[PDB]
Scaffold this active site. Structure first.
Site, PDB file in Angstrom:
ATOM      1  N   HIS A 164     -30.943  40.964   7.009  1.00  0.00           N
ATOM      2  CA  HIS A 164     -31.273  41.055   8.411  1.00  0.00           C
ATOM      3  C   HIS A 164     -32.120  42.294   8.664  1.00  0.00           C
ATOM      4  O   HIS A 164     -31.730  43.417   8.339  1.00  0.00           O
ATOM      5  CB  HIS A 164     -29.964  41.089   9.206  1.00  0.00           C
ATOM      6  CG  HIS A 164     -30.128  41.026  10.691  1.00  0.00           C
ATOM      7  ND1 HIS A 164     -29.395  41.827  11.550  1.00  0.00           N
ATOM      8  CD2 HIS A 164     -30.898  40.238  11.478  1.00  0.00           C
ATOM      9  CE1 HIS A 164     -29.723  41.544  12.798  1.00  0.00           C
ATOM     10  NE2 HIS A 164     -30.629  40.582  12.783  1.00  0.00           N
ATOM     11  N   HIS A 202     -37.948  45.182  17.210  1.00  0.00           N
ATOM     12  CA  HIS A 202     -37.108  44.147  17.787  1.00  0.00           C
ATOM     13  C   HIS A 202     -37.214  44.186  19.294  1.00  0.00           C
ATOM     14  O   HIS A 202     -37.580  43.186  19.927  1.00  0.00           O
ATOM     15  CB  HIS A 202     -35.651  44.302  17.393  1.00  0.00           C
ATOM     16  CG  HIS A 202     -34.761  43.297  18.040  1.00  0.00           C
ATOM     17  ND1 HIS A 202     -34.180  43.504  19.277  1.00  0.00           N
ATOM     18  CD2 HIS A 202     -34.401  42.050  17.656  1.00  0.00           C
ATOM     19  CE1 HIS A 202     -33.462  42.444  19.600  1.00  0.00           C
ATOM     20  NE2 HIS A 202     -33.581  41.548  18.635  1.00  0.00           N
TER      21      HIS A 202
END
Length: 245
Positions: A11, A53
């Site tokens: 991730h 992000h």
């Protein structure tokens, strides 16, 4: 549809062992043998594709405000590392071209999550899709992902061949019609939403399934036994590239 992607996915490059969405994190991922990384991509104001992000720089850097509102020459000044440890002092926001390069050197596959600045999905979808096409030539095609139907639709026109996945953080009763129209190979779900049943029916509809963010081995194993195809994990030290149920 055919499917070369690994059981386990790191991730944001380095999971929680390193500052996310960073070249150095992708390195940490390769140090634990991981075969595939996921990471989050956006446009600068002038249209460079880089990783971040959030809409805003604060959480994962010494910068402030809306990353997408800055020009690359200015995002170049940001430290996206020392917020994590004193060891990552250098760490810059990475261009997508550079991440493609690390992938090639470490022999890693890529799940590019298209994560546009709010309001920029269509433009972001199109741009990432065409850049992915260029930079991943000669290589496993990257799995394009997104929460935005915005961006998935634009990727579906710009680079039809590149496989696509729909991210859902919440269940949608129309997932079948939606994935069909979008032409998705995969559906990417928050792990809380699954059980033996949904896995079963997602499979029957012909879909590959990825799950996030699973850190506990017993629950990784379980999910794999149900039929899930990828576990996206933060615990890249404990899950680990050859995990099985």
């Amino acid at each position: 549809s055919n499917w070369p992607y690994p059981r386990i996915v790191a991730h944001r490059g380095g999971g929680k062992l390193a500052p996310e969405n960073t070249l150095a994190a992708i390195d940490v991922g390769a140090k634990y043998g991981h075969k595939m990384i996921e990471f989050d991509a956006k446009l600068s104001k002038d249209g460079e594709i880089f990783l971040l992000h959030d809409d805003n720089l604060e959480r994962t850097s010494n910068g402030w405000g809306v990353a997408g509102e800055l020009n690359w020459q200015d995002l170049l000044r940001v430290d996206a590392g020392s917020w994590y440890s004193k060891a990552f002092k250098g760490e810059p926001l990475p261009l997508l071209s550079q991440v493609a390069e690390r992938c090639r050197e470490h022999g890693m596959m890529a799940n590019i999550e298209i994560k546009p600045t709010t309001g920029t999905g269509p433009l972001t979808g199109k741009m990432v899709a065409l850049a992915a096409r260029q930079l991943w030539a000669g290589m496993t095609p990257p799995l394009l992902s997104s929460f935005e139907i915005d961006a998935l639709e634009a990727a579906q026109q710009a680079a039809p061949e590149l496989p696509r996945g729909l991210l859902l953080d919440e269940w949608r009763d129309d997932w079948r019609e939606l994935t069909a129209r979008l032409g998705c190979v995969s559906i990417h779900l928050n792990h809380k939403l699954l059980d033996k049943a949904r896995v079963m029916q997602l499979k029957d509809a012909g879909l590959r399934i990825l799950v996030y963010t699973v850190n506990k081995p017993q629950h990784a194993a379980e999910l794999l036994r149900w039929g899930v195809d990828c576990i996206c994990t933060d615990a890249i030290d404990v899950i680990g590239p050859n995990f099985t149920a």
